[PDB]
mmCIF file of all heavy atoms in Angstrom:
data_model
loop_
_atom_site.group_PDB
_atom_site.id
_atom_site.type_symbol
_atom_site.label_atom_id
_atom_site.label_comp_id
_atom_site.label_asym_id
_atom_site.label_seq_id
_atom_site.Cartn_x
_atom_site.Cartn_y
_atom_site.Cartn_z
ATOM 1 N N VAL N 44 -56.204 -316.980 92.691
ATOM 2 C CA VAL N 44 -57.024 -317.880 93.459
ATOM 3 C C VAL N 44 -56.786 -319.325 93.091
ATOM 4 O O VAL N 44 -56.364 -319.602 91.991
ATOM 5 C CB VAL N 44 -58.517 -317.483 93.163
ATOM 6 C CG1 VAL N 44 -58.808 -315.989 93.388
ATOM 7 C CG2 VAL N 44 -58.836 -317.940 91.697
ATOM 8 N N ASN N 45 -57.038 -320.304 93.996
ATOM 9 C CA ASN N 45 -56.975 -321.670 93.706
ATOM 10 C C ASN N 45 -58.230 -322.089 92.868
ATOM 11 O O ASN N 45 -59.332 -321.843 93.244
ATOM 12 C CB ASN N 45 -56.863 -322.440 94.979
ATOM 13 C CG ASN N 45 -55.685 -322.015 95.976
ATOM 14 O OD1 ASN N 45 -54.793 -321.472 95.462
ATOM 15 N ND2 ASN N 45 -56.062 -322.214 97.224
ATOM 16 N N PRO N 46 -57.949 -322.779 91.816
ATOM 17 C CA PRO N 46 -59.125 -323.130 90.912
ATOM 18 C C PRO N 46 -60.179 -324.071 91.649
ATOM 19 O O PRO N 46 -61.313 -323.899 91.349
ATOM 20 C CB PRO N 46 -58.508 -323.867 89.808
ATOM 21 C CG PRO N 46 -57.163 -323.271 89.662
ATOM 22 C CD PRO N 46 -56.732 -323.067 91.051
ATOM 23 N N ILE N 47 -59.730 -324.822 92.685
ATOM 24 C CA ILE N 47 -60.718 -325.620 93.372
ATOM 25 C C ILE N 47 -61.747 -324.777 94.040
ATOM 26 O O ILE N 47 -62.959 -325.267 94.171
ATOM 27 C CB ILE N 47 -59.939 -326.528 94.482
ATOM 28 C CG1 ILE N 47 -60.985 -327.570 95.226
ATOM 29 C CG2 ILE N 47 -59.279 -325.618 95.533
ATOM 30 C CD1 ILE N 47 -61.381 -328.635 94.249
ATOM 31 N N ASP N 48 -61.348 -323.577 94.388
ATOM 32 C CA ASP N 48 -62.381 -322.678 95.126
ATOM 33 C C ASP N 48 -63.441 -322.073 94.318
ATOM 34 O O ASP N 48 -64.421 -321.495 94.772
ATOM 35 C CB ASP N 48 -61.572 -321.610 95.849
ATOM 36 C CG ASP N 48 -60.743 -322.061 97.130
ATOM 37 O OD1 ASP N 48 -60.996 -323.038 97.658
ATOM 38 O OD2 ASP N 48 -59.711 -321.392 97.352
ATOM 39 N N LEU N 49 -63.271 -322.317 92.933
ATOM 40 C CA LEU N 49 -64.315 -321.814 92.095
ATOM 41 C C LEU N 49 -65.245 -322.893 91.517
ATOM 42 O O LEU N 49 -66.235 -322.590 90.779
ATOM 43 C CB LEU N 49 -63.648 -321.198 90.889
ATOM 44 C CG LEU N 49 -62.711 -320.012 91.125
ATOM 45 C CD1 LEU N 49 -62.107 -319.445 89.884
ATOM 46 C CD2 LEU N 49 -63.461 -318.889 92.017
ATOM 47 N N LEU N 50 -65.020 -324.221 91.932
ATOM 48 C CA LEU N 50 -65.882 -325.281 91.357
ATOM 49 C C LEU N 50 -67.128 -325.485 91.877
ATOM 50 O O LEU N 50 -67.818 -326.431 91.752
ATOM 51 C CB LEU N 50 -65.023 -326.513 91.462
ATOM 52 C CG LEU N 50 -63.694 -326.523 90.562
ATOM 53 C CD1 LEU N 50 -63.117 -327.966 90.680
ATOM 54 C CD2 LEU N 50 -63.950 -326.193 89.208
ATOM 55 N N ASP N 51 -67.568 -324.468 92.899
ATOM 56 C CA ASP N 51 -68.870 -324.622 93.610
ATOM 57 C C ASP N 51 -70.096 -323.897 92.686
ATOM 58 O O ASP N 51 -71.087 -323.835 93.210
ATOM 59 C CB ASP N 51 -68.853 -323.970 94.879
ATOM 60 C CG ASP N 51 -68.336 -322.585 94.987
ATOM 61 O OD1 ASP N 51 -67.746 -322.134 94.005
ATOM 62 O OD2 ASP N 51 -68.701 -321.983 95.980
ATOM 63 N N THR N 52 -69.672 -323.266 91.611
ATOM 64 C CA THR N 52 -70.678 -322.682 90.701
ATOM 65 C C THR N 52 -70.535 -323.108 89.340
ATOM 66 O O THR N 52 -69.385 -323.548 88.922
ATOM 67 C CB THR N 52 -70.700 -321.121 90.798
ATOM 68 O OG1 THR N 52 -69.487 -320.601 90.240
ATOM 69 C CG2 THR N 52 -70.695 -320.690 92.180
ATOM 70 N N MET N 53 -71.488 -323.006 88.495
ATOM 71 C CA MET N 53 -71.472 -323.304 87.172
ATOM 72 C C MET N 53 -70.559 -322.307 86.393
ATOM 73 O O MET N 53 -69.727 -322.715 85.527
ATOM 74 C CB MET N 53 -72.885 -323.248 86.426
ATOM 75 C CG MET N 53 -73.733 -324.482 86.857
ATOM 76 S SD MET N 53 -73.089 -326.096 86.265
ATOM 77 C CE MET N 53 -74.568 -326.956 86.044
ATOM 78 N N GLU N 54 -70.718 -321.172 86.744
ATOM 79 C CA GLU N 54 -69.664 -320.049 86.216
ATOM 80 C C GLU N 54 -68.363 -320.395 86.528
ATOM 81 O O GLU N 54 -67.479 -320.291 85.605
ATOM 82 C CB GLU N 54 -70.135 -318.708 86.839
ATOM 83 C CG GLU N 54 -69.315 -317.542 86.249
ATOM 84 C CD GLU N 54 -69.773 -316.179 86.898
ATOM 85 O OE1 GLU N 54 -70.579 -316.155 87.652
ATOM 86 O OE2 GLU N 54 -69.154 -315.096 86.522
ATOM 87 N N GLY N 55 -67.993 -320.698 87.707
ATOM 88 C CA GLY N 55 -66.590 -321.080 88.164
ATOM 89 C C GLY N 55 -66.094 -322.312 87.490
ATOM 90 O O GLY N 55 -64.952 -322.254 87.109
ATOM 91 N N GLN N 56 -66.956 -323.264 87.242
ATOM 92 C CA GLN N 56 -66.574 -324.490 86.519
ATOM 93 C C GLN N 56 -66.028 -324.073 85.000
ATOM 94 O O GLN N 56 -65.118 -324.526 84.547
ATOM 95 C CB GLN N 56 -67.721 -325.413 86.376
ATOM 96 C CG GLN N 56 -68.091 -326.225 87.604
ATOM 97 C CD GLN N 56 -67.164 -327.401 87.873
ATOM 98 O OE1 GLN N 56 -66.475 -327.930 86.957
ATOM 99 N NE2 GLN N 56 -67.268 -327.958 89.068
ATOM 100 N N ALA N 57 -66.895 -323.165 84.382
ATOM 101 C CA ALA N 57 -66.601 -322.775 83.034
ATOM 102 C C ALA N 57 -65.268 -321.985 82.983
ATOM 103 O O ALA N 57 -64.540 -322.196 82.144
ATOM 104 C CB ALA N 57 -67.707 -321.839 82.633
ATOM 105 N N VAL N 58 -64.977 -321.048 83.908
ATOM 106 C CA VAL N 58 -63.810 -320.325 84.092
ATOM 107 C C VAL N 58 -62.603 -321.305 84.215
ATOM 108 O O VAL N 58 -61.495 -321.011 83.514
ATOM 109 C CB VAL N 58 -63.776 -319.372 85.362
ATOM 110 C CG1 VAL N 58 -62.554 -318.759 85.563
ATOM 111 C CG2 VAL N 58 -64.834 -318.245 85.001
ATOM 112 N N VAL N 59 -62.700 -322.233 85.118
ATOM 113 C CA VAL N 59 -61.646 -323.157 85.290
ATOM 114 C C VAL N 59 -61.326 -324.074 84.086
ATOM 115 O O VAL N 59 -60.116 -324.114 83.590
ATOM 116 C CB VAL N 59 -61.785 -324.056 86.493
ATOM 117 C CG1 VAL N 59 -60.792 -325.195 86.627
ATOM 118 C CG2 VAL N 59 -61.784 -323.199 87.864
ATOM 119 N N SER N 60 -62.353 -324.501 83.446
ATOM 120 C CA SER N 60 -62.219 -325.231 82.252
ATOM 121 C C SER N 60 -61.659 -324.548 81.123
ATOM 122 O O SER N 60 -60.787 -324.974 80.333
ATOM 123 C CB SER N 60 -63.502 -325.816 81.732
ATOM 124 O OG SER N 60 -63.447 -326.642 80.571
ATOM 125 N N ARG N 61 -61.903 -323.236 80.984
ATOM 126 C CA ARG N 61 -61.388 -322.403 79.952
ATOM 127 C C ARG N 61 -59.847 -322.007 80.140
ATOM 128 O O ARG N 61 -58.995 -322.236 79.233
ATOM 129 C CB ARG N 61 -62.126 -321.022 79.933
ATOM 130 C CG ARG N 61 -61.469 -319.941 79.180
ATOM 131 C CD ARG N 61 -62.342 -318.648 79.155
ATOM 132 N NE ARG N 61 -61.596 -317.456 78.838
ATOM 133 C CZ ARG N 61 -61.869 -316.555 77.931
ATOM 134 N NH1 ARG N 61 -62.934 -316.831 76.994
ATOM 135 N NH2 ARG N 61 -61.171 -315.437 77.690
ATOM 136 N N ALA N 62 -59.454 -321.950 81.449
ATOM 137 C CA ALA N 62 -58.051 -321.733 81.697
ATOM 138 C C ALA N 62 -57.370 -322.927 81.413
ATOM 139 O O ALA N 62 -56.243 -322.900 80.930
ATOM 140 C CB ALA N 62 -57.965 -321.295 83.158
#
Side-chain angles (χ1 to χ4, degrees):
Chain N
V44 309
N45 308 328
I47 188 67
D48 292 333
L49 302 182
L50 298 185
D51 61 337
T52 70
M53 286 299 209
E54 183 177 2
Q56 289 273 349
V58 169
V59 170
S60 179
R61 167 178 158 122

